[PDB]
Amino acid sequence: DAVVVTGYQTVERRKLTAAVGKLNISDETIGAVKSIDQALAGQIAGLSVTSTSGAPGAPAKIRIRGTSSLNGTQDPLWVLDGIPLEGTDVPQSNVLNDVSNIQQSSIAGLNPADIENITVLKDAAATAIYGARAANGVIVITTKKGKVGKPVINFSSKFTYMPTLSTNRLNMLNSQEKVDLELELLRSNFAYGDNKGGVSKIISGYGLTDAYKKGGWSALTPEAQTDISRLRNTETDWGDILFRDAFNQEYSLSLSGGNERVTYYTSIGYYQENGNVKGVGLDRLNIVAKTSYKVNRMLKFGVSLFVNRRNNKTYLTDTYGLVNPVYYSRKANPYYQPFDANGNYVYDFDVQNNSDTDLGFNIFEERKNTSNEETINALSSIFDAELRFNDKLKFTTQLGLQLDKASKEQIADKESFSMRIIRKNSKYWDSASQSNKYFIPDGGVHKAYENTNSQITWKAMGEYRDSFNDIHELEVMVGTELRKTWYETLFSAGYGFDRQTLTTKPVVFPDEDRARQFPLHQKTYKENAYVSFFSTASYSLMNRYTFGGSIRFDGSDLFGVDKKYRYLPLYSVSGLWRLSNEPFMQGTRKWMDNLAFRVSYGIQGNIDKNTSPFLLGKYIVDNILPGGSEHMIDINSAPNKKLRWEKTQSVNVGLDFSVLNQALNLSVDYYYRKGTDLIGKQMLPLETGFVSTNINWASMVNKGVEVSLSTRNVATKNFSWYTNLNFAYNNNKVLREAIPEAQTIPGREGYPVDAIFAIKTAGLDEEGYPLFYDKEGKKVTLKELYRLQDPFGLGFTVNSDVTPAEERSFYSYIGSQDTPYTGGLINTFSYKNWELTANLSFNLGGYVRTTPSYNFINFDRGQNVNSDILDRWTPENTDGRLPALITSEKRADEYYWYDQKSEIYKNLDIWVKKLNYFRLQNLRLGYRLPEKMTKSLGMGSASVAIEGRNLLVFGSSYKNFLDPESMYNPYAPPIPKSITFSLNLN
């Protein structure tokens, strides 16, 4: 439009000196999304949106101009109606199974049907007014408002069909080749687990496990052959047992309006979204109530209330995801039928990644006996008052209260695998009985989580706007902001739980460590306060030269009390020059509407909220003389009085260029943002009192180009065609970071945050082992590469003189997990009443380290495996490209070096694959009913639409995986395709 909302001011486009990306929100633009963090994929240049999981409610990882921190906050800041939101951060862990239980951001509570615009502030000139919350970018949510006039009511109803998850892309073995592989492994000497499997049990139950190894198929009795044939002929569809098609619903009723003194808006919205995995679902019901009154010609008071309630139902899994249905679709044996002839349960004892079959797993039994249900109650209230003291001087105050309360309840009955693992992990050595017992009572477990995230914000800013001599314009704002946040969590667990009786049983922990291993009651409390004083100035001359600036002094309890760093400015200096308005360039005005050059410089800031400036210690009992119990304190973390925000120096050079009556618009931005004082672990000098600690010392850099081109290809009375191309390249690079001396993989210094270092392989030798490269470029083995020595000759007694600093030279840099080139292409056609929008997105130039399809030392034959195990090296198939299943018979030294260092096989370059995928994010065809037909129905307007989401994904090949965004984490569902039919009435 003609104005930009930055969360503090409203800046005219002709006086905009900053990089700002706008996105108008409607059905014709973003589609039928249910969360607004998922509608930004490919719509704004420089804003890269990636999906962490495919389950409903899963937060999206968003990066604006790349990663701006190492160990601090990396997610953007979401501002709702001028009040920043809390709980929007995406929790990032190591365990791949944590995506099963990832918490939803508060952004999932805001209905996209109640939002008009999304404004993304990208550079220093736009973000520096946010102080120490600006290094990661800011996304400003402008919610819909009542329009002065007759009341307007909207009733949108969307019905979505989600197709079933097809595992044909998983490339898994059926019963035939699985049984053949098991038989060939039983013949061979590969005996890591030979009790596991289906063929192994059948053969060994008749005492033929030794006869088969010597004679083969003929050495088996027909009693043992008919069973194996039955195994071969038994086929089970695990994409039908585990996955489902879904019918999702969504309804929204929005009534608004206003008159010369009061503008009102009300909205209700309820949606039900199912997951592709059976038993997974998510409901959201929300209410929005806005009303703004004009008390006098000066005073104006408004109240906005957003109330939200979400309900999530999902499956219970272990800590390490042996149960996870998405991953269990890769482990379930093709010939294993969950039910027997009489309908009784049949248990899967091969579910553990260890060589122990005692805990059985049945998917139906777990679904019946387990539950993971969460309920989220959220509230956001904004009271904004404004006093127009003068035509030029205005004052504004704003109070924002946010409260999110999540109550989680995980129940696992006694007859379920999730309880079996708990009881097994409760194994302890009874000293008085010389045996092993279990201290967890016989019964179910009920775990309860209560998380509360509160925030109160108060802003007060005074704005002055004056114009002198009709060529000078001055805009000055001064304001302050107090913001306090609380995060309180409670966890409670009760063992021996009975689902109906609601009764638990006492637990007797042998030690305190075992009591910490099974916590029964945990409390967590975090509280922070922030005081900020900010100001902004802008001077426009002759409608041609705009000079802008901002400053912000931030203080918090998360910073040190040193007077040297206590209140240091976070500023920005900007500049705009409209070349099109120049008298010497007025000749080229019959075809050029705009040419503006804008530059910006400034310092942003980041807060690492997991670091404290206080002396965190622990109480111990000890003494310095015989007798007496002195209570001593051992320092856990060093007190850092110079703790402060992570500085980021940004330089942005922009260019706007519009021609032929908005026929062609171009916005180019080149940015260079160098980050310093990033909070990270440094190896301190020994005179500091500590070997190492977390201080402000690291460094970083991002730099690249954002290109946003919008075109009106066809402009005809009936047919119109528009194109919107957004492109962004980011060159991330870590400049100064520290790694442990014991670390053997190279550090990221000089490479992106998600750098992938892999051991380049030249193939296989004549015995199927991987072949490596030495410094001279010749093919060597592991024994030559690591210089393995075995003096004792026992095999498992190998050692190497290769230092970690030298082992870091074996790895080579492949790429980065985060794709440098991101963006999208949106094509809009309008033919009479028909409107077709095709939004496609691209993330090109990435790499992903995939889990090996099989382990060549630890291959578990009791679980299914990908179809590339058949392309491994075999004595009967010497043309295989993947490593053979090795044993300790041939080369004990190399085998045991591979065994005791599991990262060599995982870090081979053959498991790292390219990541270049284009995705058809949206394809929506809508029809607007003729005006006469709507008038006959009494509606101001009406419309229908058929929409396809995630229908097409192409680009680089993603073999053995269901999605290119699902190549890293096997425990997260893929992004589901959907077909939505929507009806809108007025």
């Binding site: 975090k526 002396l615 003389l625 001593m632 304190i633 051992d634 973390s637 301190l684 005179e687």
Partner: protein
Amino acid sequence: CDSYLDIRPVGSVIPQTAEEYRALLARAYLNVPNDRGLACLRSDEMLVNDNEYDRNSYGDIERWNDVSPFPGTSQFTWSNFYNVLFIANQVIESQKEITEGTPEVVNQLVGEAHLLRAYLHFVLVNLHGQPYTKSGALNSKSIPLKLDTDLEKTLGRNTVEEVYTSILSDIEHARELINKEKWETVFSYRFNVLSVDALQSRVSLYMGAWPKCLESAEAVLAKKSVLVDMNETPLALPNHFESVESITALEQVMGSSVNNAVWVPATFLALYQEGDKRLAAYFAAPDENGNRKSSKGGKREFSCTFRVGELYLNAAEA
């Protein structure tokens, strides 16, 4: 609407009260390194055993093998010295912020921190710095003085004169602040006024400032001069923490491992003439080679930093 910036995190022990800072200073006292035993291993009063493991750790220190030790040899604990110095500096900088404490208790805590910092600097400059009495050693850089709790700076080595000036200043501060006359026997590792005067006497003795050394030694002797009489109890060790002679029992000079790995060379025993009860009290049964073991250390109850006999010797020398 609410903001003060005064919030203390909950979930860890943050020392704020006088009892918490006393606990912190007690932990600092516990971690005081006993590197004077290793330093005296470099002298003529110790002989490492003929074993291999017992000699691969302490053999090179005794042989004055500064260049190319065995990498398995024992190392002097720079890290422990500067960690205790950090804790002492934290206690010093935390004055006027210690809550829930009598002023006579906070003052005693700060004085103990000052005296501990002075003693640690003295021991460090003695271990790794040229002697104060040596010619041309006054302007030579010896050790970096730790006088703050800054984690973002690299300290350069201070000259011996600067280190000793800082030591004297900290001794004066402790004298002005320490107000306890005598601690409990079980808590006698802490510093008191007698400790201040004894440390001042030893410092001035090492600098060669004989007047101040005599003054401090005579002040200690006037306040306390009772010794252990060897003739009424032959097996009465003067350095025992429960003896009437020990002033401060902070550091167990002799660790278990070092004391188990050395003898007393026959020359040092021959220095003991006939009629010395210390000959039959300090050391154990004679060995066939003629070198005895020791019974003055190796366990926690033989901790001794200052005692009245050392004060008598300092007074006599001055």
